[PDB]
Amino acid sequence: GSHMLRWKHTSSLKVANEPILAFSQGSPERDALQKALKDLKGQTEAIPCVVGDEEVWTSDIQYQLSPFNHAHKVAKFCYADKALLNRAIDAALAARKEWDLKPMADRAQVFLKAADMLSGPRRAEVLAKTMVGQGKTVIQAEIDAAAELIDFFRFNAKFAVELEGEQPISVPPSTNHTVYRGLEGFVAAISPFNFTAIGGNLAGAPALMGNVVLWKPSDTAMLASYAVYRILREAGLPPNIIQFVPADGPTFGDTVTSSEHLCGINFTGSVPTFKHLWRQVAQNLDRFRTFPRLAGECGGKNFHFVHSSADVDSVVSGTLRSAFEYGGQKCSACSRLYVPKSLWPQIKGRLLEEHSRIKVGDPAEDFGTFFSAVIDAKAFARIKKWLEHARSSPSLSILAGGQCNESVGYYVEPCIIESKDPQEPIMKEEIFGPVLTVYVYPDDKYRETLKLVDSTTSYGLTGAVFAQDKAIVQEATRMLRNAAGNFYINDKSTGSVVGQQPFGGARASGTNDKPGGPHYILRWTSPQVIKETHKPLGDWRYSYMQ
Amino acid sequence: HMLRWKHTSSLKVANEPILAFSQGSPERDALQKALKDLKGQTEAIPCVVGDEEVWTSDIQYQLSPFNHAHKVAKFCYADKALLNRAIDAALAARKEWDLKPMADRAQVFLKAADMLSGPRRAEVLAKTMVGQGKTVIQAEIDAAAELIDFFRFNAKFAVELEGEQPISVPPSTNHTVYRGLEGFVAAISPFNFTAIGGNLAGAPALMGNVVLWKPSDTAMLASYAVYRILREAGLPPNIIQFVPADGPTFGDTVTSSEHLCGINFTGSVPTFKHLWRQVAQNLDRFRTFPRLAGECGGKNFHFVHSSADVDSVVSGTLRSAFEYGGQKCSACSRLYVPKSLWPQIKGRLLEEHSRIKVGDPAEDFGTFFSAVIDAKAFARIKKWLEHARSSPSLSILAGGQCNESVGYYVEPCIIESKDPQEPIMKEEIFGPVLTVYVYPDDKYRETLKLVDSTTSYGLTGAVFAQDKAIVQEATRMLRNAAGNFYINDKSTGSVVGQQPFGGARASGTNDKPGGPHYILRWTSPQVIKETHKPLGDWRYSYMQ
């Protein structure tokens, strides 16, 4: 009755959130970051595609510009052509079986080592590249390229190693065991400009689970994304496990959805693009060896709802941060504020006062900067068009800000707008800029207004309620159950922390796979169950048949 | 502390015993009585929307497979209008159900499980026997044990899922709310397991969803019995709508609703692909991205190494290939045998074959298996038998007969193929048809590669061998050839909580019903962060 398959005990991992640094004057991290910023001034990095260990250049040359000084080309890179993408697929597939068979703990080690590199010796580098290339301030780069990315790597490693301990029941005469296989084929990872960490997670989490990946990073985050890629390779990621393949979006999607070996798309970006990819997979369903798994996070139109019992100062500070940090370029950013008439004079006064103190400028040169330029010319143009809409629309009034200037960087001042119409298009459409719209509701219609918060937009990502009345908090929490996948009581709608607020929402906001939580990795494994029976089978007949 | 989170508890459950049905036993007496209760009976089964029993003019009949003159049920197809009303009524009931504590929803399923275990066991077994053509033991493992286990184990998994909570750090408290999906779920269940219908509709309902359940026409009698048990166990109105319907009509209607949030499907590859494509076509109409779960069949193998225990190969293969007429997504239909063992295995298979009784499972408990499910299945299987008679690379070694004059009767059939790539080695027949390929002993490794490469499927498979090195090698080589992989056991008969069931390649999405993660497909988590102290400045210290 000897067991021919032997299963080894699996270990556990102790991890904690990466501490956020203060960057106080005289601190080593402030000095190190200033040096790293200086190291990037006037520099352009030539960033190749990487397939296996080969640096590959195509003729389709592209540039990443510094958002706050667009004369500065921070990187020159190139778009992979269809030939290179297909070569990358073939090479990844040829490397997959060995990587998938590697113990989970050994794959995890790569990510734990990368996390330690990011935490210590490479922190200043990835922060500086995120600041200069994506226009983040010190603290926005810190929470993203350091803390969040590090946390994704450590927490997903923990969740993955511990997943192997989730095993079925065995009853004599048999032993049952679940093998957490990677997906058979390759995964396409498509990451956004606004968080360096998201690129690391979109490519990294599937790789952790035994997959091979073609990673198309965001053009406007290339410098920091490549830094992360190199760190993973230095941390021991073998060749052909993650292919670094910047590419034209449509071209990339066409190529990966045309491969019989596509097994997943891990996407963060626009609703229309996610839908397009979903439709391409559906169109090509007959060619795939298996059913591809699509994961998408697709944005929001997020709210701060204020009840008359709210702490005014908390509303003001939390809303200013949520609406304007990183120029409002977060899928979680507050863009609609609902205020009761009774509190509006106080809140309006405070918002306008604090608004006048917000500094917009160069985040590398002036650490006094609250936020800097938006990401690129396309974003600038879109935001400018909304500001013009606000000026023309009778129902919209600009209370503060409204200016923009793209002569040196893509600079947009923080803008506060009041709408008399809770259904105005500006209350519905995601702007991805520093543009806050306020709707003032009569206190006596708070319940009807909560229904409007829930029904006005197509999105379901984040939202906050500010209130100190328990009954109201309970009621609002029930009414807004599906209006936000990340819901906040007396805190701002942005700044989810890995392991604390797993992030994601439904409605138009995506598939809600909750990166940052313990279940996200399950999308990237296809379990097999093995039953070994240790005694001979008896007769095919059953006793009741006699 | 505006929000207080009541502590969650654990739930202890064990597998339901499989009963022996020995002479004089309470279960055998009860089953015989229940079978007698069904003889000559036709139940008129309505659509059920809320508590309303609804009849349309589109009358349909379920026939007893082994005696098709016996109409075991008269039912009707829900039209587009009725399906749309069912959606509307379900959606209006959803919020209250979703807000009900997980433990309270679980209680309905635990009560249903106890009913199925005891007072309703004979009923659901008998209805599965008479309506779907199962023998006593096949009905027992399905309508009792598997269904009871789905209900108890999913309840345990769901209650314990609420204990999976994030880290809280002062001054904030974080909590995950495992919300049901917003919208309705369409459950589309197959004829071949009463339990699967219960799971496809029941698991999403457990997680706070509302469901339109289209049961299989050819399993209507037992499916409605399960539905009624759920309602009696406390399932409120409009949580599961009982809506038999024409397949295309049902799919067209649910995929046309802006409120579709999931399809839980078990059935054919082409139908699943069609539904997937309908959802993709209508993406712009949906309020959210619908979640499709599909289990889509297999072309499953038993691979024999020369060191195998021959008697185990023989009994395991006869069971896997022929129990319930081979009408399992897990059934062995391709057997690979080394030349050195073939004279033994051939001789034993052919001798035991002659002893297999095919007949009426209600009247003769000596029956190994009975008629296949319906006229369409009979015709498809006959086409394959005719192909075997035509093809020069295929030889019928035993069986090959069929007769639909009284029931849809197909004898067990054993075929040898000289071509390991013959279409019969690739395509799912869903009948009692076993094809054998004999390989030279010294080419076992090349043959393992063929096991992996020949078909489009990835569901079940077994290796019979008593050599550790060979088992380790085969296990590695066949890693993606089977999502349920067996060493020295038959490829069918997965048990909830022991062998979570499913596979990839063309076999579906592999969500592993029967395991702890399946329920995650039917929840959309929300995380609530409550901060207990006023927020500070919007400025940061490093800015000063």
Swiss-Prot record, chain A:
Keyword Cell membrane found: no
The entry marks the following residues as binding substrate, namely 496
| Annotated metabolic or biological route of this protein | Amino-acid degradation; L-proline degradation into L-glutamate; L-glutamate from L-proline: step 2/2
Keyword list (alphabetical) reads: Acetylation, Mitochondrion, NAD, Oxidoreductase, Phosphoprotein, Proline metabolism, Transit peptide
Q: Which reaction does it catalyse?
A: L-glutamate 5-semialdehyde + NAD(+) + H2O = L-glutamate + NADH + 2 H(+)
Question: Which residue positions does UniProt flag as site: Transition state stabilizer?
Answer: 194
The Enzyme Commission number assigned here is 1.2.1.88
Query: What about PTM?
Result: Acetylation of Lys-82, Lys-97 and Lys-385 is observed in liver mitochondria from fasted mice but not from fed mice.
Record-linked PANTHER family: 1-PYRROLINE-5-CARBOXYLATE DEHYDROGENASE FAMILY MEMBER, DELTA-1-PYRROLINE-5-CARBOXYLATE DEHYDROGENASE, MITOCHONDRIAL
Can you state the subunit structure given in the record? Homodimer.
This protein is called: Delta-1-pyrroline-5-carboxylate dehydrogenase, mitochondrial
Q: What organism, scientifically named, is this protein from?
A: Mus musculus (Mouse)
In the UniProt record, what gene is named as encoding this protein?
Aldh4a1
